[PDB]
Amino acid sequence: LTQSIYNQKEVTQVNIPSTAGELGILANHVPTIQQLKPGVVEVIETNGETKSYFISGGFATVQPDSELSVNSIEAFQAEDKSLTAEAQKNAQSADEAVAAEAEIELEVLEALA
Amino acid sequence: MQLVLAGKYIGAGLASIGLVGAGIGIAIVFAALINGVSRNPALKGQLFTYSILGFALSEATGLFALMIAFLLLYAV
Amino acid sequence: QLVLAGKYIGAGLASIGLVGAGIGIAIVFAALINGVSRNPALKGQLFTYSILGFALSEATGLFALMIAFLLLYA
Amino acid sequence: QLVLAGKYIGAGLASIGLVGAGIGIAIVFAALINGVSRNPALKGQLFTYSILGFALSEATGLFALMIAFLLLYA
Amino acid sequence: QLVLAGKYIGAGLASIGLVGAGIGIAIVFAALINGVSRNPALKGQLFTYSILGFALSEATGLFALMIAFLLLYA
Amino acid sequence: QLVLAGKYIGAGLASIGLVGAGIGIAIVFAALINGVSRNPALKGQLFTYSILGFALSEATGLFALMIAFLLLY
Amino acid sequence: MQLVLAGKYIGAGLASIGLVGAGIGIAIVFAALINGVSRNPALKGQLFTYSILGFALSEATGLFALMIAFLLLYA
Amino acid sequence: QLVLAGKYIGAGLASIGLVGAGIGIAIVFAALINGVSRNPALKGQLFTYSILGFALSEATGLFALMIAFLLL
Amino acid sequence: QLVLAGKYIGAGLASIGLVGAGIGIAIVFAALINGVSRNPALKGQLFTYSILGFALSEATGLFALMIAFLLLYAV
Amino acid sequence: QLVLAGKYIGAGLASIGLVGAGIGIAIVFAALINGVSRNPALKGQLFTYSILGFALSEATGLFALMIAFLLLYAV
Amino acid sequence: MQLVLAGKYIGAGLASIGLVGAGIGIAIVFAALINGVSRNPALKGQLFTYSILGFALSEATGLFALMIAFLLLYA
Amino acid sequence: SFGGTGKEAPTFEEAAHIADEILALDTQYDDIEIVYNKVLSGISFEPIMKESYSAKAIEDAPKFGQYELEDDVVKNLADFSLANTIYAAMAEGHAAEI
């Protein structure tokens, strides 16, 4: 990604917001892979240390190695909007030129946290 | 009226076989409620008011079957 | 008695035809919950198809309940 | 007396042939929800097939309900 | 009279043999809806197999409706 | 009398076996339509394989239809 | 009075056929629970409150078919 | 009379055992297409297993038909 | 004689309710095998849930066995 | 005579228990094709587990054929 | 007494229908076994023990319908 | 063929502006191979030919059954990997240039 955060050393606990619904991959999980949707992502170290990230797309390749892989475009902490309110209204109102650009930019703001 | 009472009791037990549709039914509703929330959890408060809707509609069907069964015992 | 036996046995066998409406409404609401959970933006349109799917499934059971009411009171 | 009994026994027994029309219409509209929730652009097309799906499904159940009426009259 | 009592009870039990047509025709437009949903450009082919498939399941429903009419007027 | 009445009741019970054939013939296209949709380049084989699918299910439905007719005539 | 009591014991056996819907019912609820926790273990404490509400309403239908058989036995 | 009538009622009751062959044999054909559609290279193998799944499920239907014709 | 026959016929009709337990227990364990497969990290939790769910589906078949045992041994 | 009639009726009612075998055999083979199509490298293994489930379901299918054979010729 | 003995054999054939739940039940266990052993072909020793545990309690519901069937023939 | 690629360090937005154009012309090839330059210790460049699997090839795999995609789109797996091979080729070949 534009940033690189996680090594592949130790098994950890992570949740994923998939297109088949928000799931959870722990330990020797089945190589279940499908595209993720722009939403919140919860990551927790051992003993319950609270962390968080964000995802704007990509898959989550899993192999019987007890280690999860995740790729996206955005990967920052949650701590890191009047212009978006106009960009949201400007997306709601689109003419005959392909609207598709309008709807997609609002599905990433559905998290809003 | 010996055959009358005997008919009131066999048909009443046959009127309880219609409770299978409600027994399987309510399960299928809550099956999708679990298998739907387990996917997208943010739709919890939404699908829960819709799992409580299909339940009362399927439970009322078994109520119709239980109505006939309770009518043959105490009425006509 | 033999006249009254057919009114009671058959009317109890009439609610056995209510299994389809009991499972039916569920399958509609099941795919409804299973479908809206996958695409929440289509919920309003799927509801007009779920209410329609439940009413027609209930109607087949109301036909069985109607025969049960007749034998006793007709 | 014995004939009139059998008319009403099979009257409620013919209403059991409505289970298939109960679960049936559901499966049509359940697949409609399970099919539309995946592809929204195919609503008006599959909606004409969902009507054709439930109509042929309930018409069968009406044939079983038809016998129940034929047993009551003649 | 004992003979006629068996013509009208068995006719009510012969209509339940059509339940499979109520669920079977549902599976047509359940697979058809689920078939068009997987690929919209296959509506011309799969719909011909749906009309063919539903006609095969409905053909067995007439057989249960045939014996029931052979037990009423034949 | 009772022989004639039982020969009519058993015929009405033999037609219940058409539900299995009514569902047996059904489930066949549930994979045909859903199999061609996933891969249209196999319609030539999936159709031939689905011909014997309902044929064997029709045979089980033509056996109960045979018994009921043996009790009618 | 020998036939009235005989029909009392026949319908009570037919009233226990309604327990099939509760047997398959409770299974379907816990089937979604096991298949729901396996996909999303984070919703364990949430679906567990729906798995209780699920089978309790499905078993209640079987308690009605069980209620009739006892009314045909001792009443 | 009572013997002959019980033979005719019991014969129609023994034909209900063919319902299990209906749903049964159909699943073997349904899983077949569902299994070949996902992998067309496994046609020659699973076709020899679909016949096995039908003949053993059809032989049970002959036993249900045998009892029906032992009463007739 | 007429009562004793109604006790025996209905006793076999009361064993029809065991079908709901046969298909029921299967679906629970089928969800267990399918659930443990998709995530073998919760076998200690899915076993605690499968047994807790199985003990409720066998109860319905137990009631159908109870009435079947009650009929032939009740007055 | 009235016993012989009940022996004939009960024989046809005992063959209804073969439905669980007819549907049952298929559901096992439904996973046999499913298991091979999802992973063709498990044909020699899962085929032994597909006949295993077939035989256990067919073993209980003999009982519905055994009881029906006891009513027409054994007694 | 012929009516009692007839109803004894009638209920004996109606009690064998309860084996259907075990016939389909044992199948669904292998329907998920071969499925799960093929979906995640890495754990056979774990899921195989739950497949025997499931079919045993599923066949036990059929043995109860077999128990009643024997009590309605020689008791 | 577009010019104006290497004015600075290439970004991801310019990869989708050329990768989708490969899919915009025609589908055609199922044997797409990318040619870039490997770099080790910055001593010299390396002439090789890397390969990018295609949808038909991706699905036709002898040992693919270990994955359990929920019957979703397998076509986007190639376009996501192809547009990321280019970004992996416009970075190691951008180091053999320096």
Residue numbers in the entry:
A (entry chain H): 15 to 94, 101 to 133
B (entry chain Q): 1 to 76
C (entry chain R), D (entry chain S), E (entry chain T): 2 to 75
F (entry chain K): 2 to 74
G (entry chain P), K (entry chain N): 1 to 75
H (entry chain L): 2 to 73
I (entry chain O), J (entry chain M): 2 to 76
L (entry chain G): 148 to 245
Copied sentences from the primary study:
The mitochondrial F1Fo-ATP synthase produces most of the ATP in the cell by rotary catalysis and plays a crucial role in severe human neurodegenerative disorders (Kucharczyk et al., 2009). The proton motive force (pmf) across the inner membrane drives the c-ring rotor in the membrane-embedded Fo subcomplex, generating the torque that powers a sequence of conformational changes in the membrane-extrinsic F1 subcomplex, resulting in ATP generation (Abrahams et al., 1994, Boyer, 1997, Noji et al., 1997). The Fo subcomplex is connected to F1 by the central stalk, which transmits torque to the catalytic head, and the peripheral stalk, which acts as a stator to prevent idle rotation of the F1 head with the c-ring.
Crystals of the YLF1c10 subcomplex were obtained from the 1YLF1Fo complex. Whereas previous crystallographic studies of similar complexes (Giraud et al., 2012, Pagadala et al., 2011, Stock et al., 1999) used an excess of nucleotide substrates or inhibitors to trap functional states, we crystallized YLF1c10 without any such additives to ensure similar conditions for crystallography and cryo-EM. The 3.5 Å X-ray structure of YLF1c10 reveals that all three non-catalytic α subunits bind Mg·ATP in their nucleotide sites. Of the three catalytic β subunits, one is empty (βE), while both the βDP and βTP sites (Abrahams et al., 1994) contain Mg·ADP. A detailed comparison of the YLF1c10 crystal structure to the bovine (Abrahams et al., 1994) and Saccharomyces cerevisiae (Kabaleeswaran et al., 2006) F1 and F1c10 complexes reveals that the three conformational states of the corresponding α/β heterodimers are very similar in the two yeast species, with root-mean-square deviation (RMSD) values below 1.7 Å, while nucleotide binding and C-terminal regions of the bovine β subunits differ. In YLF1c10 both the βE and the βDP site are more open than in the bovine complex, while their βTP sites are similar. The post-hydrolysis position of the γ subunit in YLF1c10 agrees with the presence of bound Mg·ADP in the catalytic βDP and βTP sites. Since YLF1c10 was crystallized without added nucleotides, the ADP originates from ATP hydrolysis during isolation or crystallization (Abrahams et al., 1996, Gledhill et al., 2007). We found the inhibitor protein IF1 bound to one of the three different rotational F1 states in the cryo-EM maps, but not in the YLF1c10 X-ray structure, indicating that it was lost during crystallization.
